[PDB]
Design a binder for these strands. Structure first.
Ligand SMILES: [Mg+2]
Ligand SMILES: [Mg+2]
Ligand SMILES: [Mg+2]
Ligand SMILES: [Mg+2]
Ligand SMILES: [Mg+2]
Ligand SMILES: [Mg+2]
Ligand SMILES: [Mg+2]
Ligand SMILES: [Mg+2]
Ligand SMILES: [Mg+2]
Ligand SMILES: [Mg+2]
Ligand SMILES: [Mg+2]
Ligand SMILES: [Mg+2]
Ligand SMILES: [Mg+2]
Ligand SMILES: [Mg+2]
Ligand SMILES: [Mg+2]
Ligand SMILES: [Mg+2]
Ligand SMILES: [Mg+2]
Ligand SMILES: [Mg+2]
Ligand SMILES: [Mg+2]
Ligand SMILES: [Mg+2]
Ligand SMILES: [Mg+2]
Ligand SMILES: [Mg+2]
Ligand SMILES: [Mg+2]
Ligand SMILES: [Mg+2]
Ligand SMILES: [Mg+2]
Ligand SMILES: [Mg+2]
Ligand SMILES: [Mg+2]
Ligand SMILES: [Mg+2]
Ligand SMILES: [Mg+2]
Ligand SMILES: [Mg+2]
Ligand SMILES: [Mg+2]
Ligand SMILES: [Mg+2]
Ligand SMILES: [Mg+2]
Ligand SMILES: [Mg+2]
Ligand SMILES: [Mg+2]
Ligand SMILES: [Mg+2]
Ligand SMILES: [Mg+2]
Ligand SMILES: [Mg+2]
Ligand SMILES: [Mg+2]
Ligand SMILES: [Mg+2]
Ligand SMILES: [Mg+2]
Ligand SMILES: [Mg+2]
Ligand SMILES: [Mg+2]
Ligand SMILES: [Mg+2]
Ligand SMILES: [Mg+2]
Ligand SMILES: [Mg+2]
Ligand SMILES: [Mg+2]
Ligand SMILES: [Mg+2]
Ligand SMILES: [Mg+2]
Ligand SMILES: [Mg+2]
Ligand SMILES: [Mg+2]
Lengths: 145, 97, 209
RNA sequence: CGUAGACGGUGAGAGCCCGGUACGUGAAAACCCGACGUCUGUCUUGAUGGUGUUCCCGAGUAGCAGCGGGCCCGUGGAAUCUGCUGUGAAUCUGCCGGGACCACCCGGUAAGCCUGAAUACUUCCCAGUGACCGAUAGCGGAUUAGUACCGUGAGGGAAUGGUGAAAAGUACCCCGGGAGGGGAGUGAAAGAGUACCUGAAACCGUGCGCUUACAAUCCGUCAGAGCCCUCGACGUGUCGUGGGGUGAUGGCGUGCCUUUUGAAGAAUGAGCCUGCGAGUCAGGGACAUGUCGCGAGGUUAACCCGGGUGGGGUAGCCGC
RNA sequence: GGCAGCCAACGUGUUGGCUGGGUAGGGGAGCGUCCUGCAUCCGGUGAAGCCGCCGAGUGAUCGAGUGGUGGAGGGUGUGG
């Protein structure tokens, strides 16, 4: 028997809003700024530390460039494949998308950190030596496009 | 407005409720109607000066037209297919007034 | 797992309706439903109100008088917040309070409210409210009076049914909502909730799909 | 009663009293957008697919040199666009773009012209809405309002709403030259009489109780006799787990806020009251703290459809 | 004799041990006003505002506690 009357917030979900400079009983005459000063009037810049050159100013820059033409992939773990494929078999980009391991559009790569014990046929783009050896030892195949 | 000159009206509220009277003039601009015998007042006039009694206007909504049967009644309207004139209707009986 | 006898205006039972547990048997969540209803009212409210600040009032952009020699207190503008008839210190602006609530939040809150409703046994089945091609508010009033005695009743009617909605519109303590327009605020507001057969079927199918 | 229980007024909270609301109807004449019959204009001297070879397709332009602007680009290694000033190209194995630069391959044809649809804006008009204000607020302006008034100027710029249900706004008599008043009457009330609802505080008195004219004082507090009033039991006043108003007389006693190491300070501010007057606000902005759901998954913006807060929306986002 | 914080034992809040002066400043828990939601209720047999008396709370206060003016609107509760 709950009406619109019987609606209550969670305990502690509501914290009281502080009214600053609303009487000397709680917060008075200074509003949490204390005594006189520029912090008592407006503010201080974040990058300003008293006139001396800041830590973002007396430090060298990092060398080298960012390589705007970088090609990006996403690793898929052999152990994760083994866990998600107890039965095993052929695996492809659509299958991995359905399994939700990588983004649908993104391009995939695999590595052999985990262990494989189920025959899995892997279709991918870039293969590493460890994943290749794991696939070969698990009695399966893995072809790269 | 269905409360027109020459009609007979019955007072609903006020000290003169339940009394019958005859309408004299109507003020559509302020929707106030003047009926003799109701809203008794006293006026002091000095030119030859004395106490004189005149009729105080009453708001039109406080009266209803009484029918020929002696019963106050709402007013409806009908359309005559002969000429196209509009005649008022006593709602309780449907007769024309 | 609950069953309700469908009822007819003639007073005869039509069939049976099965209610799944996973939709109407969840434990109530007072905090969640409170948050959702608060967001509902926050969205309902319109944020149209404004005042004029010191920079928007008319005229008085020049110094009232000289600094020294006047003898009175120092002032800078005729329209300062200290002055009467001047601007306001912090003036409100036209604004909105739309609060986005996640779909699981709203769905879970509605499901909790409906589960509590089914627990309190205020859900019913009606094949049709009034006779077709004849809107009659009096017939609907008599039907609802016979069916229940609570002050407020909520009825869910399909969109294509117009006569029932038109007949039931005028009465004040009763409210009508299409099954696609059901919301937690109206669920909580009314005392009794009634489902039409088509509306309940559509709602259940949409939930299960 | 209700397909109308929106909203105002009527002598107090009215869907059944009226103004009116759901719902229907209705235009002689005029205006803006939407079809349906003389007449006008073009070409069917034209059209479609098929085998080799001998001035035009936008010029003082593209581009270049200097000097400057605007794209994040502030002469930096500086592409692209534009402009001022001088020079100045080809017509297709011609060009310029592809972020000082080019060989082979790769994509488009500059100096000519216009073109609806998504968008921004609201002086004006209509219909509505408001966890917007209710007369020092809200537009300066609910009222002679951009009026009075100030300034010869560009201009600046005010204050001033409420009788009552209706004027039924007090006949008449008396004091007074009038102003002003007292009765009598109107009205529910005149402790609503136009200086008009409610009428506080600063403000100015009257009457009553007590105190004070040997008295040295941030003016009060703690004791405290007397006088006056009050409540019960008991008689003429006396006590009683008594209150009230005054307080003669003794102890203690240096206003408040600032800024200060330091203030009663002879340091600053306040003549007083009534209101007005100060951490507010927007962002898929960011961090950390409680709270809620799912979970290796968590989720949406803009936008589409419901007089409704709902349903859709995988573009992105954050860790794995 | 009473209130309040921390802590230990046991319990579905009692007992026991300590602490409680504080500006700037931090943390925690609340009072009151206006405006909305709803369950509902008060009010011309007198609401709000106005002026007192008596009470009660550790506080901002409260009294669905009453007296004189006033004649038209407000309130509990949980929320925002
Ligand atoms: Mg200092
Ligand atoms: Mg200071
Ligand atoms: Mg400081
Ligand atoms: Mg300006
Ligand atoms: Mg001011
Ligand atoms: Mg203003
Ligand atoms: Mg907020
Ligand atoms: Mg109404
Ligand atoms: Mg009532
Ligand atoms: Mg009303
Ligand atoms: Mg009426
Ligand atoms: Mg540059
Ligand atoms: Mg360049
Ligand atoms: Mg060309
Ligand atoms: Mg062009
Ligand atoms: Mg356009
Ligand atoms: Mg006022
Ligand atoms: Mg002048
Ligand atoms: Mg009388
Ligand atoms: Mg006065
Ligand atoms: Mg008055
Ligand atoms: Mg004295
Ligand atoms: Mg003496
Ligand atoms: Mg002294
Ligand atoms: Mg002393
Ligand atoms: Mg002394
Ligand atoms: Mg102060
Ligand atoms: Mg100093
Ligand atoms: Mg100091
Ligand atoms: Mg000093
Ligand atoms: Mg002095
Ligand atoms: Mg000095
Ligand atoms: Mg000084
Ligand atoms: Mg001082
Ligand atoms: Mg100084
Ligand atoms: Mg001074
Ligand atoms: Mg002065
Ligand atoms: Mg922030
Ligand atoms: Mg958090
Ligand atoms: Mg949606
Ligand atoms: Mg203890
Ligand atoms: Mg302390
Ligand atoms: Mg402090
Ligand atoms: Mg009364
Ligand atoms: Mg009374
Ligand atoms: Mg009272
Ligand atoms: Mg009154
Ligand atoms: Mg109120
Ligand atoms: Mg209250
Ligand atoms: Mg609440
Ligand atoms: Mg609150």
């Amino acid at each position: 028997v709950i009406k619109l009357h019987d609606l209550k917030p969670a305990p502690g979900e509501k914290k009281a809003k502080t009214r600053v400079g609303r009487g000397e009983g709680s917060k008075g005459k200074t509003a949490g700024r204390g005594t006189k000063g520029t912090k008592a009037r407006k503010n201080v810049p974040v990058m300003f530390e008293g006139g001396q050159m800041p830590i973002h100013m007396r430090l060298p820059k990092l060398k080298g460039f960012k390589n705007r033409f970088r090609t990006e992939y996403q690793v898929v773990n052999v152990g994760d494949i083994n866990k998600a494929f107890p039965q095993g078999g052929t695996v492809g980009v659509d299958e991995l998308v359905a399994k939700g391991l990588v983004r649908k559009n993104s391009l995939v790569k695999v590595l052999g950190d985990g262990k494989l014990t189920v025959k899995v046929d892997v279709t991918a783009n870039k293969f590493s030596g460890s994943a290749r050896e794991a696939i070969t030892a698990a009695g399966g195949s893995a072809t790269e496009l | 407005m269905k409360v027109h000159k020459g009609d007979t009206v019955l007072v609903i509220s006020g000290k003169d409720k339940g009394a019958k009277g005859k309408v004299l003039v109507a003020y559509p601009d302020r929707n106030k109607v003047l009926v003799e015998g109701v809203n008794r007042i006293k006026k002091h006039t000095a030119v030859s000066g004395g106490i004189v009694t005149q009729e105080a206007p009453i708001h039109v909504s406080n009266v209803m037209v009484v029918d020929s049967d002696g019963k106050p009644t709402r007013v409806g309207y009908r359309i005559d297919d002969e000429t196209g004139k509009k005649v008022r209707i006593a709602k309780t009986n449907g007769k024309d007034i | 797992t609950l069953k309700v006898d469908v009822k007819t205006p003639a007073g005869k039972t039509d069939g049976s309706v099965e209610l799944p547990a996973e939709l109407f048997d969840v434990e109530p969540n007072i905090a969640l439903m409170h948050q959702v209803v608060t967001a509902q009212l926050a969205a309902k409210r319109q944020g149209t109100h404004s005042t004029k600040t010191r920079g928007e009032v008319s005229g008085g952009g020049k110094k009232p008088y000289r600094q020294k020699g006047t003898g009175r207190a120092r002032q800078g503008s005729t329209r300062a917040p200290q002055f009467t008839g001047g601007g306001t210190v912090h003036g409100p602006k036209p604004r909105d309070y739309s609060q986005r609530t996640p779909k699981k939040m709203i769905a879970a809150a509605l499901r909790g409210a409906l589960s509590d409703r089914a627990r309190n046994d205020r859900i019913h089945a009606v094949t049709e409210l009034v006779e077709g091609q004849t809107p009659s508010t009096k017939s609907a009033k008599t039907f609802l009076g016979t069916l229940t005695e609570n002050k407020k009743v909520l009825v869910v009617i399909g969109r294509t049914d117009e006569v029932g909605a038109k007949s039931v519109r005028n009465l004040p303590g009763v409210h009508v909502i299409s099954p696609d327009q059901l919301n937690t605020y109206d669920v909580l507001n009314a005392d009794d909730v009634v489902f039409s057969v088509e509306a309940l079927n559509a709602y259940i199918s949409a939930n299960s799909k």
